[PDB]
Design a protein around this ligand. Structure first.
Ligand code: HEM
Length: 182
């Protein structure tokens, strides 16, 4: 994943737990070499998985819990770190934003050549609910999607309830979330 993702994880941890904790995580993750992350540079996906595993051990939180928190954080981090207009352009309500997500990542992918974005498809079931299909080249990031959706709820001052109804882990084709919103 691009350095931007790893910087945001670093930022989230460093802000909540301080630099010493960050340095321990960095060390345990096997990254003491890397002096800083470069936002627009591509890293091995392993860098991100190791950082998360190491943060889990050092902080004593399951990795999935940290992914949820990171998902929520990302919505705020991107708005403040160069992508606030891009976010605004993706809509002014939760359901519209989710319809625009693939288009938003298409736009991101202009600037980030090697992007491997997720694919999201919405099947609306009412004016207050939708099924969200999430497909990815990567494993284990469904909890991050959960936090993202909650971050977007906060963004749009909209109450949202998100329940995953299909899990790749149980052998399903892809993750599916049932979403209800104000
Ligand atoms: C303007 C705001 C955003 C920017 C700049 C951005 C950019 C990125 C970047 C660089 C990656 C890494 C992919 C790679 O390195 O190949 C990524 C991944 C991801 N993004 Fe976005 N993103 C934004 C908003 C969102 C939002 C709002 C969501 C909410 C659903 C989202 C969902 C995801 C997920 C689930 C991944 C994990 C990659 C995967 O599943 O394969 N992104 N995004």
């Amino acid at each position: 994943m691009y350095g931007l993702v790893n910087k945001a994880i670093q930022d989230m941890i460093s802000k909540h737990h301080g630099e010493d904790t960050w340095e321990a995580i960095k060390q345990k993750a096997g990254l003491e070499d890397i002096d800083f992350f470069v936002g627009m540079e591509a890293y091995s996906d392993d860098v991100t998985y190791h950082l998360v595993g190491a943060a889990s051990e050092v902080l004593g939180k399951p990795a999935e819990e940290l992914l949820i928190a990171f998902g929520e954080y990302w919505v705020t981090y991107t708005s403040e770190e160069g992508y606030g207009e891009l976010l605004a352009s993706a809509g002014d309500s939760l359901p519209e934003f989710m319809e625009n997500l693939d288009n938003l990542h298409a736009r991101v992918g202009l600037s980030f050549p090697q992007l491997r974005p997720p694919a999201f498809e919405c099947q609306h079931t009412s004016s207050k609910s939708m099924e969200l299909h999430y497909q990815s080249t990567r494993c284990g990031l469904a909890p991050m999607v959960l936090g993202l959706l909650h971050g977007l709820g906060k963004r749009f001052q909209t109450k949202v309830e998100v329940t995953q109804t299909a899990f790749r882990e149980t052998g399903e084709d892809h993750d599916i979330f049932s979403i209800k919103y104000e």
